[PDB]
Amino acid sequence: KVFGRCELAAAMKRHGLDNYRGYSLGNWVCAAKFESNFNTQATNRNTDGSTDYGILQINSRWWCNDGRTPGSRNLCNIPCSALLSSDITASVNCAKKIVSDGNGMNAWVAWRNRCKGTDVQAWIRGCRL
């Protein structure tokens, strides 16, 4: 499902992302835009075998089990297949545990490279919440 700008916002807010470890809803929506263009079906290999899963480009290497990443752990404890659904609950709860790895939201590249050091609140601007 290709989410809206504001319905993923209202979706991630309702799941308690707005100011989670102190990152505004504007950080998540911004990240989400450049990870997967608001696509729950987005799937990306890496150079180290492992594959990026869904809205937040969550990493099979450290997080979900996808059945073909040898040196893996799924500390999030989910089949990657879940992070591809129209449902973002597994994608959010997994993200709460990543953002809380004393790394903030830097764990995600397309946020510390395209989002950090910009007006992130423009990304949820003019939306009803």
From Swiss-Prot:
Superkingdom of origin organism: Eukaryota
SUPFAM superfamilies: Lysozyme-like
Miscellaneous comment: Lysozyme C is capable of both hydrolysis and transglycosylation; it also shows a slight esterase activity. It acts rapidly on both peptide-substituted and unsubstituted peptidoglycan, and slowly on chitin oligosaccharides.
Catalytic reaction equation(s): Hydrolysis of (1->4)-beta-linkages between N-acetylmuramic acid and N-acetyl-D-glucosamine residues in a peptidoglycan and between N-acetyl-D-glucosamine residues in chitodextrins
GO molecular function, one term: lysozyme activity
Gene3D superfamilies per the UniProt record, alphabetical: 1.10.530.10
Tissues showing expression: In the egg white and polymorphonuclear leukocytes.
Keywords: Allergen, Antimicrobial, Bacteriolytic enzyme, Disulfide bond, Glycosidase, Hydrolase, Secreted, Signal
Domain C-type lysozyme: 1-129
Record EC number: 3.2.1.17
Binding residue positions for substrate: D101
GO biological process, one term: killing of cells of another organism
GO cellular component, one term: endoplasmic reticulum
Organism listed in the record: Gallus gallus
Function: Lysozymes have primarily a bacteriolytic function; those in tissues and body fluids are associated with the monocyte-macrophage system and enhance the activity of immunoagents. Has bacteriolytic activity against M.luteus.
Covalent S-S links between cysteines: C6-C127, C30-C115, C64-C80, C76-C94
Family classification: Belongs to the glycosyl hydrolase 22 family.
Family matches, as InterPro entries: Glyco_hydro_22, Glyco_hydro_22_CS, Glyco_hydro_22_lys, Lysozyme-like_dom_sf
Major localisation: secreted
Designated name of the protein: Lysozyme C
